[PDB]
Amino acid sequence: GPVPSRARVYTDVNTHRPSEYWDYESHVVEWGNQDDYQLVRKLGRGKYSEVFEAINITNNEKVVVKILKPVAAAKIKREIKILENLRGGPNIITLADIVKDPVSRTPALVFEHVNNTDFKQLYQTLTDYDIRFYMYEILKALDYCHSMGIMHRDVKPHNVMIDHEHRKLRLIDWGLAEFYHPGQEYNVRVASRYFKGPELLVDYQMYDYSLDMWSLGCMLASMIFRKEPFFHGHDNYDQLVRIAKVLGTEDLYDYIDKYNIELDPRFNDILGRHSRKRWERFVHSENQHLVSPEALDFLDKLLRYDHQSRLTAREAMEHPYFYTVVK
Numbered sequence: 001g002p003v004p005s006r007a008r009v010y011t012d013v014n015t016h017r018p019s020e021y022w023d024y025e026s027h028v029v030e031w032g033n034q035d036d037y038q039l040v041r042k043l044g045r046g047k048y049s050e051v052f053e054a055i056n057i058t059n060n061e062k063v064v065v066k067i068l069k070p071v072a073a074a075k076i077k078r079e080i081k082i083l084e085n086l087r088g089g090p091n092i093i094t095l096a097d098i099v100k101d102p103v104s105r106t107p108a109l110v111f112e113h114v115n116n117t118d119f120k121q122l123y124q125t126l127t128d129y130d131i132r133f134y135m136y137e138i139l140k141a142l143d144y145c146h147s148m149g150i151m152h153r154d155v156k157p158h159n160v161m162i163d164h165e166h167r168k169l170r171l172i173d174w175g176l177a178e179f180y181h182p183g184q185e186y187n188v189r190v191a192s193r194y195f196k197g198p199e200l201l202v203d204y205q206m207y208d209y210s211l212d213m214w215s216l217g218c219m220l221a222s223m224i225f226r227k228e229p230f231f232h233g234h235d236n237y238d239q240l241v242r243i244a245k246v247l248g249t250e251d252l253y254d255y256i257d258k259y260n261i262e263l264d265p266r267f268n269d270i271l272g273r274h275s276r277k278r279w280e281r282f283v284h285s286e287n288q289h290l291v292s293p294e295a296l297d298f299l300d301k302l303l304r305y306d307h308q309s310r311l312t313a314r315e316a317m318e319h320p321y322f323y324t325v326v327k
């Protein structure tokens with residue numbers, strides 16, 4: 001069968017913390033007062049929750065309320081335990097309260113409000129320096145959560161809120177996050193299509209923190225190359241073919257051979273034979289202002305098939321790409 005895998009970092013974090021830390025099922029939720037919050041406007045609805053801009057009437061401060069759908073209401077102790085564990089961590093969204101919504105009869109998570117700058121506006125105007133700056137901020141959140149024995153599993157642009165005026169960034173939506181336990185087989189049905197790591201696309205279940213590093217690399221490639229999304233698959237199968245057209249099929253076969261993984265036979269008639277492309281192929285006059293040899297070297301070390309071969313978040317922070325960032 002498949003060869004086992006374990007993270008190269010933070011492998012022992014959940015065994016050396018008390019069981020109360022990771023055993024989310026045993027956690028007793030401390031319910032707050034739903035009357036403290038007045039819903040103001042519906043911001044959006046996803047598959048797992050309805051999101052509202054609200055006001056905390058006990059302090060007159062803006063808050064964000066996530067009213068969980070019943071499908072999310074089952075795995076809420078996991079999200080709550082993760083949010084409580086990571087609270088106060090660098091660039092981690094702050095869970096302010098947990099209340100019972102009187103209408104939905106489900107939990108509503110109350111978060112600090114972030115006056116986020118419009119996503120299109122940030123993608124279209126962030127400078128080379130700003131991309132480095134904000135990428136370093138995201139790395140602080142990922143190294144923190146990984147050091148805390150947690151993988152986000154849904155790193156993507158919409159889960160990174162930026163208040164550009166205050167140079168403030170928060171990593172949000174911890175609903176898909178999990179505790180990392182060496183040897184555990186996880187569900188591969190995580191992350192958004194364009195950000196799914198090759199381990200998910202080849203159904204390799206014994207993955208770890210490094211999945212977040214692939215997703216981060218997909219965001220960086222889209223940002224510096226002005227190509228949204230960078231790997232533009234029609235479905236989960238074409239998603240792997242899109243990756244193979246850039247990294248090449250030879251390294252993909254070396255990856256699946258190393259882990260004794262068998263590709264779905266449906267890849268026999270769609271994968272083809274592709275050489276690895278040099279990152280310079282993606283540079284053009286409209287993105288050259290965002291590209292540098294250090295950006296390309298950094299990206300090359302995130303976007304690797306072998307999950308054990310990608311930079312870790314702490315190693316990534318040491319990369320020359322960040323030397324210009326004021327610390």
Ligand SMILES: Nc1ncnc2c1ncn2[C@@H]1O[C@H](COP(=O)(O)OP(=O)(O)OP(=O)(O)O)[C@@H](O)[C@H]1O
Nearest residue numbers: 043044045046051064111112113114158159172173
């Ligand atoms: N902490 C927060 N502060 C301010 N706005 C927030 C916060 N968390 C979420 N939002 C709001 O959530 C809205 C986005 O809707 P929703 O949260 O359902 O999905 P998303 O983050 O766009 O992506 P996805 O649902 O695919 O993960 C935005 O209007 C954003 O301002």
Ligand SMILES: Brc1ccc2[nH]ccc2c1
Nearest residue numbers: 122123131134135157160
């Ligand atoms: Br760099 C960077 C990282 C995450 C982001 N989310 C929205 C804009 C943006 C920029």
Ligand SMILES: Brc1ccc2[nH]ccc2c1
Nearest residue numbers: 119123157219220222223
């Ligand atoms: Br980094 C990054 C990559 C792609 C994006 N699309 C919209 C915001 C954004 C940020």
